Scaffold this active site. Structure first.
Site, PDB file in Angstrom:
ATOM      1  N   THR A   1       0.824  -1.203   0.000  1.00 30.58           N
ATOM      2  CA  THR A   1       0.000   0.000   0.000  1.00 30.58           C
ATOM      3  C   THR A   1       0.862   1.258   0.000  1.00 30.58           C
ATOM      4  O   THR A   1       1.960   1.266   0.554  1.00 30.58           O
ATOM      5  CB  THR A   1      -0.943   0.040   1.216  1.00 30.58           C
ATOM      6  OG1 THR A   1      -1.476   1.363   1.366  1.00 30.58           O
ATOM      7  CG2 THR A   1      -0.195  -0.345   2.481  1.00 30.58           C
ATOM      8  N   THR A   2       0.360   2.319  -0.630  1.00 29.88           N
ATOM      9  CA  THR A   2       1.063   3.596  -0.673  1.00 29.88           C
ATOM     10  C   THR A   2       0.049   4.720  -0.814  1.00 29.88           C
ATOM     11  O   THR A   2      -0.820   4.667  -1.689  1.00 29.88           O
ATOM     12  CB  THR A   2       2.066   3.648  -1.832  1.00 29.88           C
ATOM     13  OG1 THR A   2       2.902   2.485  -1.802  1.00 29.88           O
ATOM     14  CG2 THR A   2       2.934   4.895  -1.730  1.00 29.88           C
ATOM     15  N   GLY A 140       3.443   4.094   3.608  1.00 34.00           N
ATOM     16  CA  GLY A 140       3.223   2.765   3.085  1.00 34.00           C
ATOM     17  C   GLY A 140       4.527   2.019   2.925  1.00 34.00           C
ATOM     18  O   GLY A 140       5.574   2.419   3.447  1.00 34.00           O
ATOM     19  N   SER A 141       4.466   0.910   2.188  1.00 31.49           N
ATOM     20  CA  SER A 141       5.636   0.081   1.934  1.00 31.49           C
ATOM     21  C   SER A 141       6.431   0.526   0.714  1.00 31.49           C
ATOM     22  O   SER A 141       7.538   0.020   0.496  1.00 31.49           O
ATOM     23  CB  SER A 141       5.216  -1.383   1.761  1.00 31.49           C
ATOM     24  OG  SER A 141       4.318  -1.530   0.674  1.00 31.49           O
TER      25      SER A 141
END
Lengths: 222, 215, 215, 215, 215, 215, 222, 222, 222
Positions: A1-2, A140-141
């Site tokens: 997710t971002t 996010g990642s």
């Protein structure tokens, strides 16, 4: 997710992706991660998918409850304090495997200069908050790639269209460099979701504009 | 002698409510309209309970303020437990009736208040708005047209009964409301409506130059 | 017979408050001015609640002292929970009204006190200062010009009504305050102001040679 | 009828305190002097609260003994929480006033006691000593010169008022104290002083041959 | 009416204590001597509290038995907390006074008892023995010579006052004790002494042929 | 008026105990003998408390049954805490006196019972048996010869006093017991003894043909 | 992080840096670490960034609450005792990863000699406090280098300008020897923050003076 | 530490040593370990030095409290039961490093034969008690050597002097075979302490007799 | 840290050092470790620096509270019992790293012989106390060296000057043999602190006498 957020003269914009993953298997394809909390704020939470939906709903209920009880809305600092307390109260759950990383964007109607009334607030694991002054932030990642893309692309932002285009490009780069982030889907027709906040309020961006911007970016990159 | 004590409490409550001003609530084409006599800008007698539920009361301020806060707290929890569309005004009226009955039975001094709960249909739907009236001892009744509480109700009730008209507009119904209460300018007047054309929240206040233009 | 008990409590409270001295509070160009008759330097009737909220009372010292301490404790917690700018005098007035109503209803002896809450605008802004009055039984009212509590209010009220002037200066309004209270030198006088030109805290005391020079 | 009950309690307390002996406290150049009529060596009416605070009372022994113990316990905790120099006699007087008011309001039988709190300046400084008086119902007052409690106060009050002199010495003020109380040798007399020239603790008792030499 | 209730309780206690027998306690060269009229060998009115403290009472057995047990429990804990030599009879007298005052104020029926606490000097030292008297309502007094409680005290008090002699021996003081109580053989008599020549424990009972030889 | 309430409770208890039958207990050469008038085989008025302690009562069954159960529970715990030989009847009598006094003082209705506690010497030793009597209000007395409770005691007391003889045998003392109670065959009679020649337990019942042979 | 404090005749000065770091990645660039607690005291907390902001706000609220309740401000010893209790009450949180190391500087208006009314107080992990008598103290991860620099540079302090210059130089040395401490930023224009307390009260130092001093030091070191 | 007790016709005697040790370093030289609990009993506790003084004082307070409350002293069995309960209640503290091993000696005045009215009671770790019938018992870290010495020397005991001499000899042997037990000190003049209980009561033995006996034993062993 | 105490005819004297150390780094140079508890007693606590200051203040507050409540001061045994209870109540904190080792010296005004009214009491970890009879005692990390020095130097003590000199010499030896103990500072001018208790009360020793004694000892050792 971002989830990304940036400031332009006269407002602020937020955007996020739509992919959910259980390890290395894709389990979600049209997940919504950006919510309109009140008339002038928006929130985006990254981490465990189950916790974020609960988090945003609790936050909105709290704000509406205070508004109804006292007859006047909270100030921006009060909202930041409530969100910080909510984040701080979840440390044990984050330790046991329920982590939530929120991002806040809003428009201050009680400021002096209307052209610089947009705010972006980021939070840490312990519960500390900071007001961004560079003009953009990502969580996010895949936030590092998006931040590095925005660092180079921020010079082209002058209005609400340029900011949206830059946010879409940053999301595209983040999806390009990270497998947990989903890119635009041309076969199915799924595109990121965006929210724009200005002096009139927070509105949702129609899918047609985002699709057009994504197509322009994709044809440019070819 | 329980009968004598009940009599004394009932006369005390009646004399307490007979002192206060009058507030009316009637249903028109767009929803429900609240008109009250309030000299103060700061202290308010009409408020909002939920998305489609309104609140109104007469009597002592510090009592129905507590009742309104309790009702709001009750309403917010239910919409988190189940859903926002599972909250109805009948449940709030029942809760208020139970609370008022318990207070009348057990407390040292009964509450000198009179409540009213109004609800409207959801967006895109059709339904007749509902009006409820709760009395200091716990009695609950349903009214189809209008509710009048506070002061000497009978002349106002007669005027409203004679001059009532269904499916009226905002200016029209507001004019009969003002005329019946007179039997009053921008100041010393509180006006609020439950608009059934709004997407989510139906409560809004009419104050300032808009009230002058409408009336 | 609850009516008889309410009557006895009301006369007890009225006779208790009728004994004490008088304290007035009026609004001028710079904010709100408090004038009280106090022979003691040690025991004070006027105090500060928050950054923009003032406190004043009449009656028995050990009661409104407790009320002031409770109000300060309530004010400090809220500004930590939400923010310093989310604290208003209306909330404090409501809390005081609830506390006084509960004490009057349930306690063995009612409090013989009369409170007043004043607020001023923040720094750099404009707003009319607000004045509230809380009565021993829980009644709350809003006053636009001045509040007089303690002793025989009516002659002082008439004098203040006749000689009041808006947008007056400090010496001017102080002179009508002293004259109305007389109807009194540096000693046996307590004077405090809510200055709206200060950055953060608006409360300051005027004592010593400055009071002599001003009056 | 709360008025009648308050009247009965007030007469009970007044009749209870009217029986006891008299104790006086006056301020001289060196500090505060306590003189009391006490036939007993074992049971004492004057004691020490803190480094610069003294205690004195009249009435029933088992009541003001409890009050003194509570005051000492309150004083010791505060000096550990913050500091030894943050303890003042006004706080102790306020605590005593609250305790006496609560006892008078709620207890079955009111306390038939009359308290007095005295304080002196710290070492190396100058300040006028302070005297407070607390009455069985919770009333608190500040006295600049002297306090007389117990028995028939009025003749003693008149004698002290007529013969008072500021900045007197120990023998001088002690002689007016003894003469006013007479209006009494080493026995049946209790004498204590708050010496402001001592480094840390200001309380000391004068008994034995020193009292004979001084008087 | 609190005055009437206090009067009724006081007469009840006085009538209760007026029924019981008489017990005397006087000081002689060796310490303190207790003489009581007790037909029963099993039930005892004189007991020991600590190493140098004695106990004596009159009235109803089941009440001062509880008081004695409470006093013993209080005494034993203190000597473990601090030391055996930090326990004095004044503390026990104060505790008894507080307990009796609380019982008189709050309990449904007051205790019809009269207590007395005696103490002697430690081994190898010199000091005048102390005698205290505690009254059913909480009053405490100090007596230098003797205490008489129970029945009609006045004739016995007069006889003891007339025939008292300091620094008397055991047989001598015992003879005036018996004669004053008569105004009685081995049976129907309880005799105990606080011997100040003993190393650790000063309490011992005189019964049997030794009482016959002494008297 | 506490005196009036005490009077009413005392007359209530006296009238309650005046209704019941009579039970006597006397000491003979072998120990203590209990004789009671009991038409019922199932419900018993005489019981055993411990190894050397007996129980007897008159009045309402459901009250002294509870008292007996409480006494047994108290006795059993002590012998486990310390030892079996550290349990004496005086402690049980004191416990019963405290319980009856508390019940009389605080309960809504006093117990209409009269108790008696008897003890005998251990095996191989010599000692005079002890008899105690506890009265509904908490009074405790010691009797050397016999105790009579229930009904009209005075004629039975006179007969027992006139015809009592020490060191009598079982048939002899049983015959005076029966004759005094008559002033009655195997049925409507309860007989029990405390035998001091038994090794461990001294309580045994005499019923059936043995009672016929003895009487 | 590094916070320094030193005494000059007639007052006391405090200063700190602006860098925040999550491991080896820079996450903050304009963090403020020195606060004005009341009219005559200042506080600086080192350690976890989230805990310090909470700590200072709680301390200020406590002091103002006591002032309002009793009508008279606390003595210096009372303030030290309250701060020591607050530090002592956080031992378990410090064990679990929330450590705060405070530094206190103030001006005593109830002293005899006005030229030596400045105080510096340091605290230990257990909760013990000590009043400095050498004239300077430093806390943080680069406090050793700053203390060693001040030990040599303290002889030049005679007034409020020399003390500020010495504090800036000590901060420069601490940033030079430690990577967790941020030095002056010439490209962006970010400089340390300072507070000066004297007989008139505690005031904030304008950025222009600090920038001038930093430029002078940098040109001197070249 | 070592405490011994033995029976002679008409009474009982107890004795103990005076050495305290922290590991291998001597920290005490005149420690008293035998106490007179009441008129006819004596107690000696071995183990941790701190616990024993507390133990004896608590036991004496309990006995005196019962005596004062009930007006009659406890029987011997009651005293044994109270001591056993007190020992049983300390199992967790013994596990965590606070162990106490008591020894009881007394004279029963309610017995039939006055010449055999002496009692010796020993206790175990769990809380069980046993009445000795062989005539002697010892506790401590050198109790085995003392018991083996008494087993051979018990035939010479006929009165209060022989029993005291045998106890001193047993203590001497225990000190000879164990380094944690202190022997007689001729340079300083420190000797063991003893208590004798008979029909008249418990009395302390003067130091002169013990010194004479120790000198006689030492010259005999040379 | 090291604190010594010894008896002389007519009084008692105590002394201690001034060094504080965090591992191997010196963090304190003028720490005071000897306090006057009441008019006739003094206390010195070794171990963690933070705990000792709290300990002494609590002890003094307790004694003053009892004095004010009962109107008569406690006996010496009561003070010893209170201190022993206070030490016993800190076992868990000592286990978790907060250890305090106190030393007590006082003058008994209720004794028979005024020339032997001085007392020295030492405490153990468990909470046991002992009254010294040899005439001297020491606590701390260098107590063994100081005790061995006093064992040889005690024969020269006849009055208050000889005892002070012997205490200073013992502290000098302890600092010589242990690095955690600080010796006299000639460059800075820091010397140990001492307290003398006699029939008149407890008084502090002026620094000039201690400086003179230290200089005499240093020149003697050269």
């Amino acid at each position: 997710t971002t989830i990304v957020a940036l400031k332009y003269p006269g407002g602020v914009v937020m955007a996020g992706d739509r992919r959910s993953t259980q390890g290395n298997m894709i389990s979600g394809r049209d997940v919504r991660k950006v919510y309109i909390t009140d008339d002038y704020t928006a929130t985006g939470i990254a981490g465990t998918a189950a916790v974020a939906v609960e988090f945003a709903r609790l936050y909105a209920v709290e704000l509406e409850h205070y508004e109804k009880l006292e007859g006047v809305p909270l100030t921006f600092a009060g909202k930041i304090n409530r969100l910080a307390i909510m984040v701080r109260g979840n440390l044990a759950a984050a330790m046991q495997g329920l982590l939530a990383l929120p991002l806040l964007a809003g428009y201050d109607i009680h400021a002096s200069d209307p052209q610089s009334a947009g705010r972006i607030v980021s939070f840490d694991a312990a519960g500390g908050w900071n007001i961004e002054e560079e003009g953009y932030q990502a969580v996010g990642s895949g936030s590092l790639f998006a931040k590095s893309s925005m660092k180079k692309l921020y010079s082209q932002v002058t209005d609400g269209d340029s900011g949206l285009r830059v946010a879409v490009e940053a999301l595209y780069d983040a999806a390009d460099d990270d497998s947990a982030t989903g890119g635009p889907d041309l076969v199915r027709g799924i595109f990121p979701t965006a929210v724009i906040i200005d002096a009139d309020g927070a509105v949702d961006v129609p899918e047609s504009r985002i699709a057009e911007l994504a197509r322009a970016i994709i044809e440019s990159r070819s | 002698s329980p009968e004598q004590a009940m009599r004394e409490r009932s006369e005390l409550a009646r004399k307490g409510i007979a002192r206060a001003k009058s507030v009316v609530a009637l249903a028109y084409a767009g929803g429900v309209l609240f008109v009250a006599e309030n000299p103060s800008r700061s202290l308010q007698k009409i408020s909002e309970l939920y998305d489609r539920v309104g609140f109104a009361a007469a009597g002592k301020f510090n009592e129905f303020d507590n009742l309104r806060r309790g009702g709001i707290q009750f309403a917010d929890t239910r919409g988190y437990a189940y859903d926002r569309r599972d909250v109805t005004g009948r449940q709030l009226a029942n809760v208020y009736a139970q609370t008022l009955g318990t207070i009348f039975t057990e407390q040292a001094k009964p509450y000198e208040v009179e409540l009213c709960v109004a609800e409207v249909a959801h967006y895109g739907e059709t339904k007749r708005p509902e009006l409820y009236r709760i009395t200091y001892d716990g009695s609950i009744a349903d009214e189809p047209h209008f509710v009048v509480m506070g002061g000497t109700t009978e002349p106002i009730a007669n005027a409203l009964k004679e001059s009532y008209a269904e499916n009226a507009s905002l200016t029209d119904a507001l004019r009969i409301a003002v005329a019946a209460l007179r039997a009053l300018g921008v100041a010393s007047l509180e006006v609020a409506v439950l608009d059934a054309n709004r997407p989510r929240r139906a409560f809004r206040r009419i104050t300032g130059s808009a009230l002058q233009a409408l009336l």
